[PDB]
Amino acid sequence: KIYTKNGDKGQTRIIGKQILYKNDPRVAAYGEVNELNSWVGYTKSLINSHTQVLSNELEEIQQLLFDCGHDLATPADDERHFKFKQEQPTVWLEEKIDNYTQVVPKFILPGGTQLASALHVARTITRRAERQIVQLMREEQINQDVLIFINRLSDYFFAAARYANYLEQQPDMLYR
Amino acid sequence: KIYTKNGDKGQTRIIGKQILYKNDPRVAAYGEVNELNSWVGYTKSLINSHTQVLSNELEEIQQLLFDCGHDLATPADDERHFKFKQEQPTVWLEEKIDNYTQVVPKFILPGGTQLASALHVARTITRRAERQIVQLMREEQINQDVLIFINRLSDYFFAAARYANYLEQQPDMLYR
Amino acid sequence: KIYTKNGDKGQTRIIGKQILYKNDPRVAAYGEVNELNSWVGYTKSLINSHTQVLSNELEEIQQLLFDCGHDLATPADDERHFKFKQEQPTVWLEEKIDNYTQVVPKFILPGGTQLASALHVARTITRRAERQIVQLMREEQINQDVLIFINRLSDYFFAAARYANYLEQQPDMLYR
Numbered sequence: 001k002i003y004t005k006n007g008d009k010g011q012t013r014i015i016g017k018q019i020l021y022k023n024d025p026r027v028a029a030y031g032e033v034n035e036l037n038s039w040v041g042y043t044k045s046l047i048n049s050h051t052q053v054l055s056n057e058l059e060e061i062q063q064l065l066f067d068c069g070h071d072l073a074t075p076a077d078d079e080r081h082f083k084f085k086q087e088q089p090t091v092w093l094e095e096k097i098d099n100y101t102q103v104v105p106k107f108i109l110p111g112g113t114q115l116a117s118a119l120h121v122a123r124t125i126t127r128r129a130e131r132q133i134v135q136l137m138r139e140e141q142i143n144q145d146v147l148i149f150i151n152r153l154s155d156y157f158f159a160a161a162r163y164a165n166y167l168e169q170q171p172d173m174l175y176r
Numbered sequence: 177k178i179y180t181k182n183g184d185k186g187q188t189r190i191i192g193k194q195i196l197y198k199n200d201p202r203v204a205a206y207g208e209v210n211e212l213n214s215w216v217g218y219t220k221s222l223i224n225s226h227t228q229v230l231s232n233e234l235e236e237i238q239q240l241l242f243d244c245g246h247d248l249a250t251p252a253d254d255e256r257h258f259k260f261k262q263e264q265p266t267v268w269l270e271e272k273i274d275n276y277t278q279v280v281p282k283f284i285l286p287g288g289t290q291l292a293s294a295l296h297v298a299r300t301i302t303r304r305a306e307r308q309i310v311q312l313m314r315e316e317q318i319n320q321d322v323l324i325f326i327n328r329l330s331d332y333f334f335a336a337a338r339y340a341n342y343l344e345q346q347p348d349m350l351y352r
Numbered sequence: 353k354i355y356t357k358n359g360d361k362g363q364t365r366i367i368g369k370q371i372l373y374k375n376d377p378r379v380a381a382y383g384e385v386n387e388l389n390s391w392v393g394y395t396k397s398l399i400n401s402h403t404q405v406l407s408n409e410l411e412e413i414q415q416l417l418f419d420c421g422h423d424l425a426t427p428a429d430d431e432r433h434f435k436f437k438q439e440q441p442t443v444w445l446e447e448k449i450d451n452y453t454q455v456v457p458k459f460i461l462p463g464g465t466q467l468a469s470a471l472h473v474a475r476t477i478t479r480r481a482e483r484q485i486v487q488l489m490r491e492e493q494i495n496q497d498v499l500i501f502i503n504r505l506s507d508y509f510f511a512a513a514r515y516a517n518y519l520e521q522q523p524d525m526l527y528r
């Protein structure tokens with residue numbers, strides 16, 4: 001049974017021993033990163049024959065987010081338990097940002113093709129998670145690498161969103 | 177006219193007499209449960225001929241959430257106004273969890289078919305609402321039955337998500 | 353390069369000089385309004401030949417939200433920088449609310465056609481943003497016009513959602 005009922009009174013476990021309330025800043029940060037991941041999976045499902053290229057990196061992004069979630073759930077002082085390192089993932093994001101940035105043609109408004117719009121939604125959820133990650137940071141020591149990655153990731157989603165639009169011959173929505 | 181303009185200064189009514197600010201913990205909990213409901217409706221709209229079975233329970237889940245919202249909007253001390261009881265709804269969820277759990281084949285990453293992905297998104301929004309419900313709980317007496325149901329509900333959505341994938345011959349996305 | 357890396361330590365700029373933490377109430381309000389906008393773009397992408405009429409106003413709503421975001425990012429005391437005025441936008445919303453309100457046939461549950469459901473999701477995200485805008489308001493002076501508009505906007509989305517359902521011959525989901 002996947003339901004233990006240990007959570008039915010509003011408390012839960014993290015990595016290590018601490019029992020925390022579900023509204024605890026750390027539980028929320030791990031939660032928002034998990035919601036971002038759900039949305040990436042949703043976005044990934046909207047891929048078709050014209051946008052097929054975007055599929056593996058999005059899938060890869062989901063792996064990276066799982067790792068981010070793991071480290072957010074891990075207290076820095078914990079003696080028995082951080083697996084996420086930002087350098088390779090972020091550089092990889094930076095390559096795609098520059099790639100997509102030069103391919104594509106005012107301020108840009110979120111929208112366009114359904115995949116582009118979903119990638120624009122990814123951008124804003126990534127940012128919502130980022131604020132919650134900073135909020136944790138202000139109370140507890142966190143893996144700063146997660147924050148570096150998350151910050152770059154919303155930039156990736158802006159870049160990929162524009163590219164998704166470009167891939168289906170769709171103009172970016174512009175502020176008039 | 178559906179707009180009274182009574183809210184234009186950031187205040188609103190709940191069940192009973194209290195005028196509360198819209199950022200009040202209770203207004204937020206009622207709000208997050210309402211967003212969950214919107215998303216279930218959205219998820220329900222993605223059903224097609226292969227996933228048609230999932231339709232009634234999702235519809236049923238929306239009824240239950242409306243009730244949850246009602247009780248969250250109701251102060252426990254209020255003399256003129258709780259309608260939600262968890263036993264039958266939660267057992268009903270537990271049956272479907274076990275059903276779906278045995279039908280379907282690493283950690284699972286959210287994604288797959290569009291309906292499966294949406295059910296995975298439902299899971300995380302349910303959890304976001306759950307944290308906001310706990311947050312209310314820590315300041316005010318609430319209907320604990322709502323919390324019991326909500327906690328089980330995200331487990332339902334994990335279970336149904338996997339099943340949605342299974343229904344369309346789609347493998348669960350796995351952590352590599 | 354769209355990534356400056358100035359944000360990698362959890363801090364960011366607003367309109368004017370203040371460097372703020374990303375979890376700052378003002379950064380969150382600007383963020384939630386930006387997420388609403390993403391979702392409107394997403395909703396707009398779900399339009400087809402039967403719902404084509406809804407397209408321009410949704411597009412127009414995205415312009416208005418960009419302005420809302422701008423003013424939320426602007427401290428009221430700032431000497432070098434408010435562009436949003438609510439009167440024309442809100443009256444325009446009020447016309448569409450009355451229009452759509454008379455066209456369309458219990459409490460209504462969110463859901464129906466995919467576009468209707470998305471407009472129902474828009475409603476709840478608008479409201480989530482509204483609570484975050486009030487939260488800012490309780491600490492800082494804000495452009496009250498933004499709040500007036502946002503409040504009416506979720507009413508617009510309820511109205512348009514029902515109409516989207518009506519446009520595709522779909523009954524509103526009712527609380528049983």
Ligand SMILES: Nc1ncnc2c1ncn2[C@@H]1O[C@H](COP(=O)(O)OP(=O)(O)OP(=O)(O)O)[C@@H](O)[C@H]1O
Pocket residue numbers: 002003004005006007008011012013014015022027028030031073302303304306307327328331
């Ligand atoms: N509402 C929530 N939001 C975000 N993260 C959560 C939430 N609830 C639990 N978690 C985290 O996810 C892990 C697994 O979730 P799960 O729902 O199984 O925990 P639980 O609710 O405490 O137990 P149970 O659901 O079996 O009663 C938990 O150990 C906790 O760290």
Ligand SMILES: Nc1ncnc2c1ncn2[C@@H]1O[C@H](COP(=O)(O)OP(=O)(O)OP(=O)(O)O)[C@@H](O)[C@H]1O
Pocket residue numbers: 178179180181182183184187188189190191198203204206207249478479480482483503504507
């Ligand atoms: N931003 C919000 N988030 C969550 N719940 C809300 C929000 N605003 C209002 N509510 C709740 O939903 C109920 C109905 O919403 P409604 O928007 O009609 O209220 P209002 O904003 O106070 O009034 P009006 O919109 O007519 O000015 C309210 O009585 C309140 O309990």
Ligand SMILES: Nc1ncnc2c1ncn2[C@@H]1O[C@H](COP(=O)(O)OP(=O)(O)OP(=O)(O)O)[C@@H](O)[C@H]1O
Pocket residue numbers: 126127128130131151152155354355356357358359360363364365366367374379380382383425
């Ligand atoms: N996580 C966030 N949520 C909401 N709004 C944000 C967030 N981060 C930044 N902003 C706002 O959006 C503007 C542009 O975003 P951007 O991500 O470029 O800022 P940054 O993260 O500080 O810089 P960089 O991403 O280049 O390190 C910022 O000046 C800030 O006002």
Ligand SMILES: [Mg+2]
Pocket residue numbers: 002003004331
């Ligand atoms: Mg569980």
Ligand SMILES: [Mg+2]
Pocket residue numbers: 151152154359
């Ligand atoms: Mg940034």
Ligand SMILES: [Mg+2]
Pocket residue numbers: 178179180507
């Ligand atoms: Mg109203």
Ligand SMILES: [Mg+2]
Pocket residue numbers: 007327328330
């Ligand atoms: Mg749980």
Ligand SMILES: [Mg+2]
Pocket residue numbers: 155354355356
């Ligand atoms: Mg940037």
Ligand SMILES: [Mg+2]
Pocket residue numbers: 183503504506
């Ligand atoms: Mg209102």
